Structure formats: C-alpha cells, structure tokens
Design an enzyme around this catalytic site. Structure first.
Site, PDB file in Angstrom:
ATOM      1  N   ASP A 195       0.826  -1.203   0.000  1.00 60.13           N
ATOM      2  CA  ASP A 195       0.000   0.000   0.000  1.00 60.13           C
ATOM      3  C   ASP A 195       0.864   1.258   0.000  1.00 60.13           C
ATOM      4  OD1 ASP A 195      -1.935   1.931   0.288  1.00 60.13           O
ATOM      5  OD2 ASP A 195      -2.442   1.418   2.380  1.00 60.13           O
ATOM      6  N   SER A 253      -0.626  15.580 -12.156  1.00 57.88           N
ATOM      7  CA  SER A 253      -0.856  15.199 -13.539  1.00 57.88           C
ATOM      8  C   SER A 253      -1.102  16.448 -14.380  1.00 57.88           C
ATOM      9  CB  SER A 253      -2.061  14.251 -13.622  1.00 57.88           C
ATOM     10  OG  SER A 253      -2.462  13.991 -14.954  1.00 57.88           O
TER      11      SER A 253
END
Length: 330
Positions: free
Chosen positions: A35, A199
């Site tokens: 994770d 992004s």
C-alpha cells in the site's frame, strides 16, 4: 541488494493485490497488500481477536526465534474506506522477494474491522508511503522500504500491476524489459506523507487532451481512480445510460456498454487506461447495472491515482533524497 516479488489480484475484478512476505525465523509467509498510501506493516496474528479472524493466515511471534516485543509500543490506523485495525508491535526479520530487513517493525493486530475479517485473502498490509505517516506510538517506526533503502543497489521500488493478471514489485532496480518507450519522471511532494504529484491533464476516449493540473497520490492500496467531479462527469457523459447513483455510491453504467479509454498526463507523456480497466462489474450478483472504475474524489479531499490508473503503467517510486515518481507505458 535487490528484491523481486510477484503480486496477484485477489479476485476477478482486481479489487486488490497480494504479495507473499516472509516474516520471522523460521519463515512464516503471509500474503500482504502493498500500500503506497500508508506506512504501517501490520498482520493478522495469534493475538487477533478470534471472532475477527476468518480464513487469514496469522503471524505467531512466539514461534519466531527472531521476534522481539517492542516494549510499550502500540498502533492504530484508520483508512480512507473507513476500515481500521490496531494492536501491539514486534520487531522481526522480514523478507520480500529475496530482500531481507532485520529489525522491521511488525505490527500485530489485536483488533480489525469487519471489512478485513470478511476478506480471507489479505493477511495484512505493507505500507510504502513515507514513514512520517507511521502510526506506532510512542516511537514512530520506519517502513520496510525505508529500512531497506541504504542497502539497495538504487533507492527505488517499482510497481507493475497486472490487469486481470499477476504483476511485480521490484526493490532496488529498474527492470528495463518491463516497459515500452521511456520513463517520464515528475515531481513529488512529501508534505502530506504520500507519493503526491501533479498530472498535466486528461483525455476521454479519442477526444482532445485537456491541459489542466490535477494534484493527487499514487496509491496501490486504493482500487479505483478518484478524480475531480468535472473530470469524472466528462468521462461518464461518453457512456450512454451512465449516471451517478447516491444509493449505490457512485457512477454506474449499463453492463452492455463499451467503455471509452481514459488518458492521463505525466509531464508531456500520456498513459492510456483501456476502457475495460474501468469496468468493475455488476453492482450486485445478476444485476445489469455495472460499477464504474472512475469515481469522484469530491468529499475525499484528495485525488487518488489508484490501481485502475497504476496498472496501466510501469511506475517508479524513487526514494532518492528528493523523491520523484516515474511512469512508463507497457
């Protein structure tokens, strides 16, 4: 040193991925959910409340000659999906794919929430976010990666998640045969303890690319792709019959649909998520309403590049003094 381990979807939907981990002496092998959005290595154990164990493999520290109780230490964690666990702490030897750390904090669960109990395939979590998020008190502990880092050939790990197929986590090296083209690297902020990056935009299907900054986290422990409501609405508008359902808890679509791809930007580079990766199947057994793999982050408080996005790429988690993230097509 290096390590290399195969990671395997837990079910036919790729709801999560499990990776075998050796703990203790002699080895006890547990299948953990790696994770990158948390920083605790915790396991089902011989100390876990009996009614809360249902099929998981447990760590039994009394059977390990290298286990030592970390005196006074406790841990307690709550995850974004509302699940939780807590317990005490041992140090022990932990190996992943041939890479061994001695003195790793192994957090033994005394209690786990229902969602953990109900998932027989996940024996615990191995956190790979920054150690500043580790919950051990009163002395915070380091992640497996942080402990291994100085010994690694290069201070990196990579995630290569499969679509409906096994993949690989590598530690300490970049497998140049595992991706196509070049790896594009992008800046990381560690301010919130996550692999947080920005992004450069998105496209829906064959549509034009929209240049827009989307700050979010690379999170192998989250199944879906969570993005701003504007972006998500633009995606689902291209699917006839798709709608946001408050009763189901997100966007659903007719199971008869062909889903468009979704592209996200990494610098000037582009990662394409095929439409099929966005199908999470019937909302309930036998239903013709299917659950979408792209969902709104509104009210999460953060955008999350979860498995839906990451499995479309070869992803480098670069833990150099100034961390960065790299993405390649594959």
């Amino acid at each position: 040193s290096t390590g290399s381990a195969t990671t395997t979807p837990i079910d036919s939907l790729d709801d999560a991925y499990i990776t075998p981990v050796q703990i203790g002496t002699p080895a006890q092998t547990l299948n953990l959910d790696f994770d990158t959005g948390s920083s605790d290595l915790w396991v089902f154990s011989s100390e876990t409340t009996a009614s809360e164990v249902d099929g998981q493999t447990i760590y039994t520290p009394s059977k390990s000659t290298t286990a030592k109780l970390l005196s006074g230490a406790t841990w307690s964690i709550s995850y974004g999906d509302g699940s939780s666990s807590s317990g005490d702490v041992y140090t022990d030897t932990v190996s992943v794919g041939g890479l061994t750390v001695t003195g790793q904090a192994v957090e033994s669960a005394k209690k786990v929430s229902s969602s953990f109990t109900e998932d027989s395939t996940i024996d615990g979590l191995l956190g790979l976010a920054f150690s500043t998020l580790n919950t051990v008190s009163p002395t915070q502990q380091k992640t497996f990666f942080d402990n291994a880092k100085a010994s690694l050939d290069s201070p990196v790990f990579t995630a290569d998640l499969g679509y409906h197929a096994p993949g690989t986590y590598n530690f300490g090296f970049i497998d140049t045969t595992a991706y196509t083209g070049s790896i594009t690297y992008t800046a990381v902020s560690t301010k919130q303890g996550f692999w947080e990056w920005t992004s450069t935009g998105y496209a829906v299907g064959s549509g034009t690319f929209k240049s827009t900054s989307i700050d979010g986290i690379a999170d192998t422990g989250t199944t879906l792709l969570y993005l701003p409501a504007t972006v998500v609405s633009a995606y689902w508008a291209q699917v006839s019959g798709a709608k946001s359902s408050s009763s189901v808890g997100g966007y659903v679509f007719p199971c008869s649909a062909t889903l468009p791809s979704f592209t996200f930007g990494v610098g000037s580079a582009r990662i394409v998520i095929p439409g099929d990766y966005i199908d999470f199947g019937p909302i309930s057994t036998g239903s013709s309403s299917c659950f979408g793999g792209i969902q709104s982050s509104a009210g999460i408080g953060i955008n999350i590049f979860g498995d839906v996005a990451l499995k479309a790429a070869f992803v480098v988690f670069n833990g150099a003094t100034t961390p960065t993230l790299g993405f390649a097509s594959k």
